[PDB]
Amino acid sequence: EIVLTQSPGTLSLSPGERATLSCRASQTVSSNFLAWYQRKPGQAPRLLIYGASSRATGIPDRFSGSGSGTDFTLTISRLEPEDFAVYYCLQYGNSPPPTFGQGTKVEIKRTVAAPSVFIFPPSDEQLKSGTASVVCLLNNFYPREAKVQWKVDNALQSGNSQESVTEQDSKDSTYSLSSTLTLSKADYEKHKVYACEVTHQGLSSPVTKSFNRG
Amino acid sequence: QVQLVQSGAEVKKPGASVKVSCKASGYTFTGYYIHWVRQAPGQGLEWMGRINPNTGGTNYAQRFRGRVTMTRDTSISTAYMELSRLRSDDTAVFYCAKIYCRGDCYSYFDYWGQGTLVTVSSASTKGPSVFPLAPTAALGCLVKDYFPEPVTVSWNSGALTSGVHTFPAVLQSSGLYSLSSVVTVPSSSLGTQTYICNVNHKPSNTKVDKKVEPKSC
């Protein structure tokens, strides 16, 4: 039972630059039966490579495959805008079971963008239901790696926040994140100042956005 | 051309049995095995099994042997993958695929079909509670405690598309989904514009038009 480990985690290169994807097998893939699939978000996987070197019919020339034994590579010469998706490598030499890789997402490379940080107290409409949800928004940042920490009276909050991130924006190719702090209202009236601290590459120093219950 | 289709997006409670169909066209149905691949949101592509539309034989992978049953008919020309006794983590998309080789064999997957999202949760259908996030200045709508996915959030009946961020839904411990839709606007517009979020939850047929007015006091 081969495991198909894809070495690149997130391939981050600008359009047209050379994309190199490494796919390693635990054991030798017999007769080099390796295939490459590209799944665009919300679509079915497409056939791109079989025989580890032969291109599927109708697939753009820039897609290439090579390798042998336990090492196979997917090469995209000119990174077309459509070539930003997830890629899987599949084995069918030592089957069954035909095992798949864990996949790598190919993202787009732009300049560092600082996140616009906003903080939203829970509304009085929510302040009737018995729960308080404070929202912290980071808008239009890159890279995605960003630490969001919540302070209630400057005390670090653990295990009370949930984070959500969007995919790449179609216009400015940035990411957007929210942290939702959910506590019972008693906690919200047990403390005064609510601070959101953001740690990002584009910030020379973390910015804290805060408010008081008033 | 070759096509493979299924009526997906089948939210099912655990303990029940989801039966995904797969209608294929463009090739000889009896000549090639139909294979099933599942994608869990956290995990990766996992081969589940295969069936011969010529014989009816089934070859399953471990972790799916005896809990999954594939059947087919040649008349309607369809293959059915059936999962019985669903549990929480089986929430996944189930693709259908026609393999390139012929007969008792294995090859690359020649063709694929659209996925089949199956959400498995005991939570019942529930409309969302929409709360304002009052206010470049940002403001938004928090939709909380709804089930199942999806809720579609527009701003101003779709009139505001620049700077809108509808984040992917998050699953809370109660089993109810939550989502936040935010938008950034110039401060000049705080006074002369009312901001409406239209949140629609089709499974509960809930339409809420919430006004995020600038903070008073």
Next chain:
Amino acid sequence: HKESCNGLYYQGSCYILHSDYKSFEDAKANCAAESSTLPNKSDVLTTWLIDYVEDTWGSDGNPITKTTSDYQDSDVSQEVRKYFCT
């Protein structure tokens, strides 16, 4: 009608606890015999009442629990629980 409510008062409805353990049908019969109903799980799912209605009967037959049940592949549903009538 709040100080005449010897239970949990929410939204205008009074939840009376029955500490004795009955089946679902028996709890339904007692609530009907008190001109009340088993609590709607949705009306209390996102409130403060869960801490009182934990592992208690609901109107739909399924009990009220904070986290969703993962397996429930047992199909006898032969269980005794506490319940509220409202």
Next chain:
Amino acid sequence: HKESCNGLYYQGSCYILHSDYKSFEDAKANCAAESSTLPNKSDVLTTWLIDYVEDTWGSDGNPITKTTSDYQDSDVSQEVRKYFCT
């Protein structure tokens, strides 16, 4: 001042349940941090509140039970219980 009580309202006293399990001293400190106290066994022995405070901490360290203590309670300190603050 009754709808302001998100718990058990009796005569003007609001009991808030804490579903988390704490020891007796921890529960005493927890209620004190909310300017409240553990429920008095005497104030609830003959009321309707007893069914809610069953097996819950009391002010005397001994838990609140329907019957009076069975005369062989040795050690209550090394165990966790739920509690109310009032």
